[PDB]
Symmetry: C3
Subunit: 117 residues, 3 copies
């Protein structure tokens, strides 16, 4: 799974263990090995949400599966709870987009996931 977190919170306010916690949250929620999770953090970013500059996190999550409607409720709940705790964000300032990719459309280790299976 590949995650991008963009936030207007300053990078020094995003704790150094945030990525590791998010890795662990999504490994459990998505049933995926920690070894195949990437987290990108773009903090101190220029973001407007709902017309204001209040702290916000805009998150994108890509995965091969584990993205049924029901799964995505669980992910939303878990990711949001982490952001509440670690980023001091209200739930209405955590936006997540979910992309379910075919293994034919993910490259890793020099070939697609589909070709390595």
């Amino acid at each position: 799974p590949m995650v991008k977190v963009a936030t207007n919170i300053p990078d020094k306010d995003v704790p150094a263990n945030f990525e590791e916690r998010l890795t662990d949250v999504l490994a459990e929620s998505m049933s995926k090995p920690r070894s195949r999770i990437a987290i990108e953090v773009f903090a101190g970013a220029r973001i407007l949400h709902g017309g204001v500059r209040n702290p916000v996190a805009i998150i994108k999550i890509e995965s091969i599966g584990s993205m049924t409607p029901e799964d995505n409720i669980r992910h939303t709940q878990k990711v949001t709870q982490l952001c509440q705790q670690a980023l001091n964000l209200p739930k209405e300032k955590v936006v997540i987009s979910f992309f379910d990719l075919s293994p034919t459309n993910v490259g890793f280790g020099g070939t697609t996931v589909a070709a390595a299976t």
Copy 2:
């Protein structure tokens, strides 16, 4: 809707009201409330387009609906016109990608849009 604008124009040359104008443009074009629009601006970025470093904007727009082929022509026209005016970009230096998401695949306020409906 969630928008990411990456540009090699310096951040001080992207006017402070750009995001608000883009918010308003897309609220009208997409028939969506301003309260549910996020704009991320990554300016001063390292971009090459068509082999050159000339000023350019690469934009991604995600939305739940409002992305028929006809809708996306209108969005392109409107977004491009804003970038022409505010970013001093020719139209051939404004590239936009449109992603139409299921409400099952957007999290907001601690659950999916689908679960909140």
Copy 3:
């Protein structure tokens, strides 16, 4: 085609000709004109992959076609080989996501690709 490369390698370690080489690689692999390829490089980024901070590249590639399963193996191989050479990355530290867009969902030159055809 539109490419985003995020890496935790420092920007001064990403050679200035990286984007041009990647442009050329994908023009050949995807059979697309150099004039319609954008490369965004977000270097010096905060990334965790597999729980560690080792150098890594997380890449997103969008295209109108040229993204059959077989095509994406070739792209993965070629892009990975470039990153091995230019970024000093092992193949298991190059992750790529492939998005195949409709021409109705790409704006360029003030209208969609579909409307310009």
